[PDB]
Design a protein around this ligand. Sequence first.
Ligand SMILES: Nc1nc2c(ncn2[C@H]2C[C@H](O)[C@@H](COP(=O)(O)OP(=O)(O)OP(=O)(O)O)O2)c(=O)[nH]1
Lengths: 57, 368
Amino acid sequence: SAVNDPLELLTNKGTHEPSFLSPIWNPIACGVAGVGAAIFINWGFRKPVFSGIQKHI
Amino acid sequence: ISGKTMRGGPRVPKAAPYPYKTKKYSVFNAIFDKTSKRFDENSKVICVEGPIAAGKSKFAKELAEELDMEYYPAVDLDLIYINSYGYDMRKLDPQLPPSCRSYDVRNFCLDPSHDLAAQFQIRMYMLRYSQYIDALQHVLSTGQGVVLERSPYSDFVFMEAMFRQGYLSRGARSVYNELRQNTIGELLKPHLVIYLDLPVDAVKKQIKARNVDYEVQSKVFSDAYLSDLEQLYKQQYLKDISTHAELLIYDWTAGGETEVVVEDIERIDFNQFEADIHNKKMLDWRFPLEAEWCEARIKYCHEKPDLMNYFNVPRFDVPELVRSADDGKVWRDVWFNAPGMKYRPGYNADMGDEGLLTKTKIGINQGI
Ligand SMILES: Nc1nc2c(ncn2[C@H]2C[C@H](O)[C@@H](COP(=O)(O)OP(=O)(O)OP(=O)(O)O)O2)c(=O)[nH]1
């Protein structure tokens, strides 16, 4: 295009493909954060770090 | 207080005993379960004090079995040096550095001039303070009174007794006085104090009659140390505790009779001190409302880590109470890699524990 039209810059043509990590990054990062938080709780109480896996799940 | 002989049988509780060693007592537990509904005349804290050779365990046992109370034994340093799994930490002494080795009362009996002794008495205070709250949790949560062979109010007598003989420096007195001024105002004073009076020579006679292998052939129990402690009892600790607690002097130079002192306890009227609100006697147990009673139960059944974290005074000016950093590092590497204390109690799989993959029960007031 030879014009710098402001309306077509915000209009989604649909040619942008989402990445492989885009729909699945936040649930697995928050799951790893929850598992690490349970490991941190078990470390702070001087429990074994994989004791009580129901809390991790 | 009413004995078993006049009552004709055992006492009856006014309510169900709360499982204070299993269930916590927060404010949301204090909404439902009240604590003044299980109190009666046998809900007093009795401390049986005396010299070191007087029979106090047998007398406190027969007083607990006669007045229907629970006997709390005297504290000894086996409670630290033996863990929950039964392993003795005195076998780690060659691995530990010599400035951080074990120091029980046996090592005090042979070697009273060691640098660990100024730690040792403080450790004894940390076992009396930890016991009395464990006594108070039995009074407020179950209603049953307690009887104690030793009390943390009387532990300063031994501190000045080792000071006068020369076993402590002035800095050890300063740090013990700072710990006492930090901690002694947080626990309730006892209702009744029994002093089993003994002369200084009869204490030595009972010491040689007991024939315990470290009490004999020890220079600690001379004619000055025992005289210093029996003088120091009756002119500091008894004079301090008589403002709150009732004080009973018993001539224990004979074998001692039990029925006469139960008779002497039973004629004491406990309701005359509650007439005056601002009375000095039994001031710490004068709670006019149920909310103050529940606050007092919360302070010892739920805030015991606060009272145990009140021992965090920094005083680095003494050289005999500062553990050096390399010695502290190898002490951690020896003590916390033991079979007993690799993890918290109840979660050590090396000493026969199973089901750890689905176990998330920490416990109540457990030392980590
Ligand atoms: N340094 C020190 N020694 C103490 C302390 N408390 C007790 N001891 C020592 C001194 C004596 O050797 C011994 C005191 O004996 P106890 O008071 O336990 O009485 P004993 O068991 O002899 O008789 P009893 O059980 O009362 O019939 O322990 C303390 O706080 N510091």
